[PDB]
Design a protein around this ligand. Structure first.
Ligand SMILES: *[C@@H]1O[C@H](CO)[C@@H](O[C@@H]2O[C@H](CO)[C@@H](O[C@@H]3O[C@H](CO)[C@@H](O)[C@H](O)[C@@H]3O)[C@H](O)[C@H]2NC(C)=O)[C@H](O)[C@H]1NC(C)=O
Ligand SMILES: *[C@@H]1O[C@H](CO)[C@@H](O[C@@H]2O[C@H](CO)[C@@H](O)[C@H](O)[C@H]2NC(C)=O)[C@H](O)[C@H]1NC(C)=O
Ligand SMILES: *[C@@H]1O[C@H](CO)[C@@H](O[C@@H]2O[C@H](CO)[C@@H](O)[C@H](O)[C@H]2NC(C)=O)[C@H](O)[C@H]1NC(C)=O
Ligand SMILES: *[C@@H]1O[C@H](CO)[C@@H](O[C@@H]2O[C@H](CO)[C@@H](O)[C@H](O)[C@H]2NC(C)=O)[C@H](O)[C@H]1NC(C)=O
Ligand SMILES: *[C@@H]1O[C@H](CO)[C@@H](O)[C@H](O)[C@H]1NC(C)=O
Ligand SMILES: *[C@@H]1O[C@H](CO)[C@@H](O)[C@H](O)[C@H]1NC(C)=O
Ligand SMILES: *[C@@H]1O[C@H](CO)[C@@H](O)[C@H](O)[C@H]1NC(C)=O
Ligand SMILES: *[C@@H]1O[C@H](CO)[C@@H](O)[C@H](O)[C@H]1NC(C)=O
Ligand SMILES: *[C@@H]1O[C@H](CO)[C@@H](O)[C@H](O)[C@H]1NC(C)=O
Ligand SMILES: *[C@@H]1O[C@H](CO)[C@@H](O)[C@H](O)[C@H]1NC(C)=O
Ligand SMILES: *[C@@H]1O[C@H](CO)[C@@H](O)[C@H](O)[C@H]1NC(C)=O
Ligand SMILES: *[C@@H]1O[C@H](CO)[C@@H](O)[C@H](O)[C@H]1NC(C)=O
Ligand SMILES: *[C@@H]1O[C@H](CO)[C@@H](O)[C@H](O)[C@H]1NC(C)=O
Ligand SMILES: *[C@@H]1O[C@H](CO)[C@@H](O)[C@H](O)[C@H]1NC(C)=O
Ligand SMILES: *[C@@H]1O[C@H](CO)[C@@H](O)[C@H](O)[C@H]1NC(C)=O
Lengths: 372, 236, 368, 174, 49
């Protein structure tokens, strides 16, 4: 490795740095609350009547177990575009608050429901924010949501004075003002009806039929999570380098015990470096302290290829007693372990004599190729 | 009957739900400025009522020292009419009957020489829970309990913080420091711009918040003990 | 009854001299004084790892760290060079003597009192009282968990004191000879007579006024400890170095929590909330931001190390000239005529105690 | 100033200046350190004397002529003739309107001349003694004799050849 | 800021900000390097005085 890090077949006498080492995690643990009640998703997708376009039926999903697999009972899925998050990882996530908006449109405008897009539905009926996160779903409903004479229940806005700000219903039967005649409710020439109706019949085709669309909006931030995926809980392990997934807080640690005095309304913990330090167990409601995982560089002490081919390692600032990483099989060599202030020295003895210094190490110690 | 006084150093609340110790963290948010002008309202009808509707903007700091249950509830919303959506809060002995039912009239006292929500048509979210206004009595009236509340709403949700202080012993808005622990954070999407208070038959402060930058100090127990403004004085 | 008052800067007391054709002024008394000088010698060694810092424990992020050439085989070399020169600085400053000398058992030097600077065997640390005061007037684990490591110097602060003790014991029983050839013994009053003979004063002045000179030296050395312990900021140069290094590390580690025009500042969050194929957009922004934030730190460190090497060189020169001999340069080894100097260690620095000669009482005369 | 330079008087631009960490709390510190050391440099160079000395009224130093370097009371600036030549051989507002400010030094060029005058008046009536202890008077020819005695030349050379040396000095300074 | 609306205006502004940040960091570094070599001369001037 020393010959590889610096391009040569002959390394001069001295000390060199090659690479780093880190302790490796052993097992994975997942902790979730006892909440088991299913979410009302199965009702919002499977309903009888949907609202109009200008007045959508916004719903808020409270705390429950959400299974993002029941919605797959709907086969077609004309569009399943997810913007903020990847759909595949939708199951293994936790959200703060979830909004669902369901309504019905025509095919030619199904592509219009997206951030940063303009038109008639996207400007006069429903505008999404540019930084929107969530998913959109659309399916075909011509065969069971149409009449031979047609359905005129659904109407969409066509004329508006000003651009619609995102997430703003505009239910208002105000007569359009055009031309130069101040209409006072005449609703005649130059004063149009803002809402125009639809007609749905089984004789139409794709792009001329009603499609049912539902949009889900999320928000991810440090807050008590109410909606979570159906991932199974696990057990608790302490004083061992493990990776944890506490309610969205994922990362490696040791998870010792703590003596902190968290207030009853606090959840997380921080430090002067704005890094997570302490956590509150979702189920047992105790306080755990998260200290990171032993890591550090390594060094090789060589007397030079001209003399010999025997080396020693200088694991920087890790205790030999517990974690000397115990791959080139030089670990805890018999009678070759020395615990100095610099770190773990493997491959050299420690005599009680004193000579001049050849290869400095640290805190005052020197290595040499002295003969017996 | 409106009197005026000095708000002193008051109205500091925990901005986030995290734990910090021995930190000098500084944050920018809606706060009550130091040494602001607080209006001491006054009314009495125990000799209908003698108070019009107060304006609401950027939240309200509300403090009072009542006897047992004289002042109970609050009314929020626009125009306080049964055409728009309004919020009601009533604090009785055992529960809170907070609701977002639509109403315009909810009180027919008729003091001699309930009738709550007289017209409630289309109700909405309810959050019945433990009562807010509770007091402990040491069988002496030397120390009058002081109750402080902060109401605000930003990007959804209704944030209500509160604190009790038995330290007061005869002064209005005393010198000292006391942070407010969060109590209620419930979700409502209605639009609020007008504010009024209730009163029980058979003392009243109003403030206003502004966007300011504060610097707060935490102790080793995680409790805020001091805070400084960054616009009041050049030394600050 | 106080208020802030603004005035015009002054320059000093107006003085007038009475120069004439035949008029001279000669002093009739002297005054031995002790000055003090403080010099930084070295900062704290440090090392930074790119991979753990820029792309924490993520092979997906580490793969994208390529296509940037080798921007991290040079930062390591620069930091290693800085650490090596930091190790060399103290070796240059202190290791001026080939051997180690021991203080004599019986301490009696013509009446002079050196107990304030000689090692005290009572305390196990084996340090002079002045060094104790210097050691008592001059978040850590968080940086350890981000790839920033702090290395120990290759001279523990228990053999540096040995070097200082050897120098100070050689300079009181051998004069300046031990800096050129073999050490040669000489009584202390004779050495002071020789030092007086080097600033144009005959030696008979010393031997006729010895008790007074010894008392003046003792009084001068007595109050320097009080002045050091009572001045609000005397060791103000070393603390500036420590504060600058701590602030640099703090502002480097704080930069990790910045969006840099990306959705989040956490690699785990972006790696779990999004799929690979479009995830190499935010990661690039984070990598670029962190690369700039680390290059700035390295450049600042190089610039700061230059100005501390430029001071370590001066400290070495002052040790070679003021201590191992007598310096004729004006106003170099302290104000006034120079007699001798003593070194003392301090955390990442040295403190020189200069002994200087100053005339006291003038008298007018007529000359031809 | 970062804000006026990078995003001139535009709150919309200033909002985007975040998400870059603190890249402008360090430039201010660096520039402040540079300014402080610039102020310290001249203080270190010039302020070598604790007191301020005055030139004697009657000027006659063994025949030497110092009028070319001593302050001239005729000009109100109180500067030597040589300093006048040095001062006469060594778009501005546009930079002021971009956030780049120029600060004045904390020594006006009318008390630096006082420091130089004090040094030069001390060095001709006291020799080198005023740099170590109290200033002591001494005639100028005696001082030159002492200075000759310091380069391995006996003093009797000076006192036997004085007018010639004075003329050579005057011609050299001219 | 006047010819375009906010929502897509945060594209050119980023380029301007980046360019100006680099152009100012270069100036600061040059100033530090130049100040070092003038301090190194002020010290010599003080010694010579
Ligand atoms: C040259 O300067 C030295 C230092 O000041 C002079 O020595 C000091 O002389 C004064 C005058 O007597 C002493 O003050 C008195 O001393 C007696 C001693 O018992 C004391 O009882 C009085 O309360 C008062 O302090 C002073 O002690 C003495 N300094 C020392 C260290 O002994 C010296 O006299 C001067 N030379 C000439 C020729 O005047
Ligand atoms: C040396 O002699 C000169 C001249 O006699 C002294 O200077 C005078 O001192 C007296 C007494 O204080 C003053 O009244 C005069 O005004 C001084 N003359 C001038 C031109 O300044 C001088 O003080 C004597 N030296 C010492 C040390 O006293
Ligand atoms: C040298 O100075 C030290 C400190 O001033 C002297 O130590 C003091 O000695 C006196 C008398 O013996 C004691 O009353 C003090 O308590 C001592 N102080 C300390 C801090 O120990 C020492 O005696 C002096 N040396 C000689 C030879 O007199
Ligand atoms: C010192 O030198 C100056 C300048 O050379 C002399 O000033 C000149 O004096 C002569 C005769 O008095 C005049 O003709 C010149 O016009 C003067 N020149 C200037 C620029 O003023 C001065 O006289 C010399 N000092 C003495 C004592 O002779
Ligand atoms: C959908 O709902 C109807 C009634 O609301 C019910 O009869 C039907 O079984 C449901 N089907 C699915 C797949 O949920
Ligand atoms: C979850 O259930 C366990 C089993 O009874 C119980 O000990 C624990 O307190 C419960 N936690 C919550 C948050 O309901
Ligand atoms: C050691 O280096 C010298 C240098 O030229 C070389 O000649 C010699 O062969 C080397 N030793 C061995 C064993 O190769
Ligand atoms: C290893 O050393 C560290 C510090 O030197 C210490 O904290 C730790 O307890 C040691 N290991 C054991 C098993 O004692
Ligand atoms: C060397 O010193 C160590 C530390 O005191 C001690 O444990 C060891 O026994 C010594 N070895 C010998 C041979 O004296
Ligand atoms: C508060 O406002 C009133 C009305 O202008 C004014 O009279 C009073 O002085 C103000 N309070 C203070 C402390 O200035
Ligand atoms: C308080 O209100 C709750 C909720 O309506 C009610 O059940 C309870 O009886 C009330 N108690 C009193 C004393 O009015
Ligand atoms: C309240 O509900 C009734 C019936 O549920 C409805 O007729 C009325 O329009 C509603 N009020 C509104 C929507 O303002
Ligand atoms: C709230 O209602 C008032 C009055 O109807 C209106 O002026 C204001 O714009 C509304 N605010 C919001 C956020 O809807
Ligand atoms: C922290 O709480 C403990 C527990 O009662 C108490 O003893 C200590 O005084 C408190 N310290 C502070 C600063 O509040
Ligand atoms: C000094 O010498 C000059 C030159 O002759 C003379 O003019 C002056 O009067 C003398 N002053 C004294 C005090 O002797």
């Amino acid at each position: 490795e020393t010959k590889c890090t610096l391009k040569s077949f002959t390394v001069e006498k001295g000390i060199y740095q090659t690479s780093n080492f880190r302790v490796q995690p052993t097992e994975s643990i997942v902790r979730f609350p006892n909440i088991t009640n299913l979410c009302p998703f199965h009702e919002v997708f499977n309903a009888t009547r949907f609202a109009s376009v200008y007045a959508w039926n916004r719903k808020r999903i409270s705390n429950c177990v959400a299974d993002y697999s029941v919605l797959y009972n709907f086969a077609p899925f004309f569009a399943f575009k997810c913007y903020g998050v990847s759909p595949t990882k939708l199951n293994d996530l936790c959200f703060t608050n979830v909004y669902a908006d369901s309504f019905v449109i025509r095919g030619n405008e199904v592509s219009q429901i997206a951030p940063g897009q303009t038109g008639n539905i996207a400007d006069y009926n429903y505008k999404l924010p540019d930084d929107f996160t969530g998913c959109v779903i659309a399916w075909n409903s011509n065969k069971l949501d149409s009449k031979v004479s047609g359905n005129y229940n659904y109407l969409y806005r066509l004329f508006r004075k000003s651009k619609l700000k995102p997430f703003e219903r505009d239910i208002s039967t105000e007569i359009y003002q055009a031309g130069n005649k101040p209409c006072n409710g005449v609703a005649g020439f130059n004063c149009y009806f803002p809402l125009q109706s639809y007609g749905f019949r089984p004789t139409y085709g794709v792009g001329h039929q009603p499609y049912r669309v539902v949009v889900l909006s999320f928000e991810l931030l440090h807050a008590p999570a109410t909606v979570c995926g159906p991932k199974k809980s696990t057990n608790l392990v302490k004083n061992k380098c493990v990776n944890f997934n506490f309610n969205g807080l994922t990362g490696t640690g040791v998870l010792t015990e703590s003596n902190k005095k968290f207030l009853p309304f606090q959840q997380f913990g921080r430090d002067i470096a704005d890094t997570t330090d302490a956590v509150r167990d979702p189920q047992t409601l105790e306080i755990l302290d998260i200290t990171p995982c032993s890591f550090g560089g390594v060094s090789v002490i060589t007397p030079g290829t001209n003399t010999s081919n025997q080396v020693a390692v200088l694991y920087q600032g890790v205790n030999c007693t517990e974690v000397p990483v115990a791959t080139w099989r030089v670990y805890s060599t018999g009678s070759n372990v020395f615990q100095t202030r610099a770190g773990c020295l493997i491959g050299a003895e420690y005599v009680n004599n004193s000579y001049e210094c050849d290869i400095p190490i640290g805190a005052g110690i020197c290595a040499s190729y002295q003969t017996q | 009957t409106q009197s005026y006084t000095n708000s002193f150093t008051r109205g500091v609340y925990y901005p986030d739900k995290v734990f910090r110790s021995s930190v000098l963290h500084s944050t920018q948010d809606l706060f009550l400025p130091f040494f602001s002008n607080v209006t001491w309202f006054h009314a009495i009808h125990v000799s209908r009522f003698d108070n019009p509707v107060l304006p609401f903007n950027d939240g309200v700091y509300f403090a009072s020292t009542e006897k047992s249950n004289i002042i109970r509830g609050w009314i929020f919303g626009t125009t306080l009419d049964s055409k728009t959506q309004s919020l009601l809060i009533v604090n009785n002995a055992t529960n809170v009957v907070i609701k977002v039912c639509e109403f315009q009239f909810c009180n027919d006292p008729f003091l001699d020489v309930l009738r709550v929500y007289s017209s409630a048509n289309n109700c909405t979210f309810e959050y019945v829970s433990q009562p807010f206004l509770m007091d402990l009595e040491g069988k002496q009236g030397n120390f009058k309990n002081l109750r402080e509340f902060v109401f605000k709403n930003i990007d959804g949700y209704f944030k209500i913080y509160s604190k009790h202080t038995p330290v007061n012993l005869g002064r209005d808005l005393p010198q000292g420091f006391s942070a407010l622990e969060p109590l209620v954070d419930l979700p409502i999407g209605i639009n609020i711009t007008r504010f009024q208070t209730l009163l029980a038959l058979h003392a009243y402060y109003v403030g206003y918040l502004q966007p300011r930058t504060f610097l707060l100090k935490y102790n080793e127990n995680g409790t805020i003990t001091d805070a400084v403004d960054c616009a009041l004085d050049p030394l600050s | 009854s106080q208020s802030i008052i603004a005035y015009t800067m002054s320059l000093g007391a107006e003085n007038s001299v009475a120069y004439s054709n035949n008029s001279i002024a000669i002093p009739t008394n002297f005054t031995i004084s002790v000055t003090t000088e403080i010099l930084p010698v070295s900062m704290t060694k440090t090392s930074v790892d790119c991979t753990m810092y820029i792309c924490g424990d993520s092979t997906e992020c580490s793969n994208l760290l390529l296509q940037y050439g080798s921007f991290c085989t040079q930062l390591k070399r620069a930091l290693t060079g800085i650490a090596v020169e930091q190790d060399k600085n103290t070796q240059e400053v202190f290791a001026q003597v080939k051997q180690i000398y021991k203080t004599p058992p019986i301490k009696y030097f013509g009446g002079f009192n050196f107990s304030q600077i000689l090692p005290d065997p009572s305390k196990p640390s084996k340090r002079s009282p002045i060094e104790d005061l210097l050691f008592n007037k001059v978040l850590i684990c968080a940086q350890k968990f981000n790839g920033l490591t702090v290395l120990p110097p290759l001279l523990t602060d228990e053999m540096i004191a040995q070097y200082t003790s050897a120098l100070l014991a050689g300079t009181i029983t051998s004069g300046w000879t031990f800096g050129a050839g073999p050490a040669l013994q000489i009584p202390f009053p004779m050495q002071m007579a020789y030092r007086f003979n080097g600033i144009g004063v005959t030696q008979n002045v010393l031997y006729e006024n010895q008790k007074l000179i010894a008392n003046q030296f003792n009084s001068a050395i007595g109050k320097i400890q009080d002045s050091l312990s009572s001045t609000p900021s005397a060791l103000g140069k070393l603390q500036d170095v420590v504060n600058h290094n701590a602030q640099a590390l703090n502002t480097l580690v704080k930069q990790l929590s910045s969006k840099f025009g990306a959705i989040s500042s956490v690699l785990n969050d972006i790696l779990s909330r999004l799929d690979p194929p479009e995830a190499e957009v935010q990661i690039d922004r984070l990598i670029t931001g962190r690369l700039q934030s680390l290059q700035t730190y390295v450049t600042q460190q190089l610039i700061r190390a230059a100005e501390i090497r430029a001071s370590a060189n001066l400290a070495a020169t002052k040790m070679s000239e003021c201590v191992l001999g007598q310096s004729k340069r004006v106003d170099f080894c302290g104000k006034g005529y120079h007699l001798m100097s003593f070194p003392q260690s301090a955390p990442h620095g040295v403190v020189f105690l200069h002994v200087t000669y100053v005339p006291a009482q003038e008298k007018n005369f007529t000359t031809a």
